[PDB]
Amino acid sequence: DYTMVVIFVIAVFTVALGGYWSGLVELENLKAVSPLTVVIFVVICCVMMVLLYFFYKWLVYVMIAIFCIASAMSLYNCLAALIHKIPEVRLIFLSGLCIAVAVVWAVFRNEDRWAWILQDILGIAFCLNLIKTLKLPNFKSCVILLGLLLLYDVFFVFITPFITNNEKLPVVIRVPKLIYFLMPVSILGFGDIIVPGLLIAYCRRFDVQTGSSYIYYVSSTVAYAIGMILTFVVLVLMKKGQPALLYLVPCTLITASVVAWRRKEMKKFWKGNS
Numbered sequence: 001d002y003t004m005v006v007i008f009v010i011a012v013f014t015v016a017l018g019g020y021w022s023g024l025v026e027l028e029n030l031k032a033v034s035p036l037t038v039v040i041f042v043v044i045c046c047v048m049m050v051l052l053y054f055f056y057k058w059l060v061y062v063m064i065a066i067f068c069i070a071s072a073m074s075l076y077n078c079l080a081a082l083i084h085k086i087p088e089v090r091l092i093f094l095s096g097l098c099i100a101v102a103v104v105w106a107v108f109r110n111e112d113r114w115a116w117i118l119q120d121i122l123g124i125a126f127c128l129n130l131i132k133t134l135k136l137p138n139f140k141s142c143v144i145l146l147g148l149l150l151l152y153d154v155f156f157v158f159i160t161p162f163i164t165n166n167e168k169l170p171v172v173i174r175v176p177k178l179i180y181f182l183m184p185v186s187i188l189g190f191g192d193i194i195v196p197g198l199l200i201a202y203c204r205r206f207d208v209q210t211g212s213s214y215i216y217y218v219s220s221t222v223a224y225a226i227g228m229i230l231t232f233v234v235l236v237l238m239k240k241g242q243p244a245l246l247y248l249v250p251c252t253l254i255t256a257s258v259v260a261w262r263r264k265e266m267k268k269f270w271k272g273n274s
Contacts (some may be wrong), residue, residue: 002178003186004232011188011228012175014124015197017129018219021081023204025132030209033138042176051217060167064106067170072120074129109168112183116174123173127190131197138272139206139256142199146249149195153243192244196224196252203256209273210265219259220252227251238273 052059078096083090098103105118138143171190176183227248234242260266 002064002184003132003175004236007173007188008225008228008232010120010124010175012221012225014127014160014193015131015200015224018128018197019200019204019217019221021128022132023075023208024202026205027125034141035144037146039232042148047138052164060169064109064167064170067104067122068106069124072098075101075122075125078128078179079230093224097229104209112176116176119170121176123170125191127197133154134198134211136198136202137274139202139260139269140271142202146195146199146253149191150249153245157243157246159273184223188244192248195245196210196227196248198251199256206269210268215263216256216259219255223255224248 037077076095076133077092079098080091083094101118102122103117105122108118110114125132136145172187175186175188177186200217202221203220207213207216227250228244230251231242231244231247234247256269257266260269
């Protein structure tokens with residue numbers, strides 16, 4: 001099907017652009033001018049999932065509204081830069097366009113014919129903003145967060161078989177089967193684009209901080225693409241829904257570690273340039 005080639009492009013240029021955009025912000029700061037909170041992150045986080053499981057009805061609409069507002073803000077921030085490069089009334093027009101798109105998507109949520117493109121655009125903007133704004137301070141935090149979320153995925157795949165209202169969470173990216181375009185789905189969540197996206201952004205940021213090159217950014221992006229290809233290959237071969245993190249976290253972490261080791265730049269990479 002011609003969706004494993006489309007969702008591979010949507011989920012790779014979003015990560016690559018987010019990492020490059022994050023490194024572009026860091027270049028201006030140089031020019032013009034956590035290990036203990038993991039327990040709280042685990043607690044609070046899983047509490048949110050428990051609340052979603054217990055109060056799905058009246059807690060899916062608040063999640064939808066939060067997604068609408070956050071995606072509208074992120075889309076405005078993303079589209080602002082492109083026009084800032086191009087040589088206020090225009091800014092308020094862009095804000096109106098973004099809020100109109102968000103409200104149109106919110107109204108047309110269950111129209112599965114053309115709401116998927118609006119959800120994909122809003123989600124791409126949201127991920128492109130979360131990859132840039134969220135600043136992981138050091139590779140220790142990157143490893144901790146990626147390993148924790150890999151363990152969360154493992155729990156996802158190891159608990160659901162034991163167990164086995166009409167709304168749909170907007171946390172996912174939906175693409176129909178692009179072979180005759182009812183339509184089936186090709187779902188890829190936000191946590192498979194953001195969580196390694198933060199690591200590739202950190203690789204680009206560290207590369208910008210240390211001299212001027214593209215080794216870490218290119219290596220992380222290539223390894224992420226290869227991990228996505230491996231995920232698709234495993235999905236095709238074994239007729240089972242395998243979480244993408246399980247194949248995206250090792251491929252990126254291992255290659256970052258190898259690049260750091262084979263460059264005498266591990267100590268700074270692990271501690272941070274600070």
